């Protein structure tokens, strides 16, 4: 499926430390040690809702991972999905296709590297059916005892390690399950936390054939199946927003560990903070939705959006504000001024520190502040290095995606 166009990626000479990331499971910062090809599955967007700045912040976070892996010479397999299953006046495809296209233009304008496999959830029905078949034949799944709606459910206890990815207690799991798409009170389930794998065909819903009856795939098995068939057991990073910690990434990992037998679906679970506005979460109800195309219409440099979001650590829940935008504009204007000078101070140390800072769990505040300091040195004192203004500009392009 079509994603978006990639920008030119300049080559930064030299090399920096290997990337280390916070793992949500272990709750600690550990090395990311991929093979020659580095693998990444980030959960995509839902076209039936508005894609806002918090969502963009997530894909920008994994853009840095992608760019840092490219800087270290890895070839990358970036896989991303689109949750076009479940959730009007005009058909659900019409207004749904438009949100996906606007997402492409928002990603392209932000110079986000596109995934190598953009897999719609409707183009992966067979892969899901394959995994459910394996899960049923091993006893990990069952068919609920219902006459008209023989739903297929994944046993919460199919994996001994269930709950390792989120750390949540069972009550917290039950409370989140109800509010994030689960059906803890569906009759016939052996355990409240059992996860739907195949929803039985209901009258009025589109359906797909399968050996266990017609219906639709479950949310978590969609992602589990796409990642398994496109990347396999050697998945370096499972990524997404923090709301996906439970249930989504717990069950999606449990499904895959059940079929493959491996202890860990992904070597790293990497979760981003949310981006709110005025002390409030962003949603269509509150009318506080801060969109990327809204800012672009208002004449906001996309690079300024990146720097605004990078001014905070990717794991911090934080808030967008006009003060944040103003500081990003001032920073962008100052970085552009210094990198335009014909000569500047040597940039070897700051580029080294930037690479170290980004390797240290994507410490973009330290990276931004270190670049601020060199720019201020360049503009206050000058220098005799005729290459460092361009060297810093291309470093900022390749590693941060910012176009000066
Ligand atoms: Ca290199
Ligand atoms: Zn997902």
Residue numbers in the entry: 1 to 87, 96 to 412
Published text:
MshC catalyzes the ATP-dependent ligation of 1-O-(2-amino-2-deoxy-α-d-glucopyranosyl)-d-myo-inositol (GlcN-Ins) with l-cysteine (l-Cys) to form l-Cys-GlcN-Ins, the penultimate step in MSH biosynthesis. Mycothiol (MSH), the major cellular thiol in Mycobacterium tuberculosis (Mtb), plays an essential role in the resistance of Mtb to various antibiotics and oxidative stresses. Structurally, MshC is similar to class I aminoacyl-tRNA synthetases (aaRSs), especially to CysRS. We here opted for Ms-MshC to carry out affinity determination as the enzyme highly resembles Mtb-MshC with an overall sequence identity and similarity of 79% and 88%, respectively.
Therefore, a crystal structure of full-length MshC is required for a better understanding of the function of this enzyme and elucidation of the binding mechanism of MshC inhibitors. Here, we determined the crystal structure of the full-length Ms-MshC at 2.4 Å resolution. While the published MshC structure in complex with CSA contains two macromolecules in the asymmetric unit (ASU), all structures solved in this work only possess one macromolecule per ASU despite crystalizing in two different space groups. At the same time, the α-helix containing residues P88–R95 is disordered in our apo structure, while it is fully structured in the CSA-bound structure. Detailed analysis of these two structures showed that CSA binding induces a shift of the T46-H52 loop region towards the active site, whereby the side chain of Y48 is flipped inwards into the binding pocket. This concerted conformational change avoids the steric clash between the side chain of Y48 in the apo structure and the ordered positioning of the P88–R95 containing α-helix upon CSA binding. Additionally, the full-length crystal structures of ligand-free and compound-bound MshC provide the first glimpse of how this sulfonamide scaffold induces a number of conformational changes in the protein upon binding in the catalytic site.
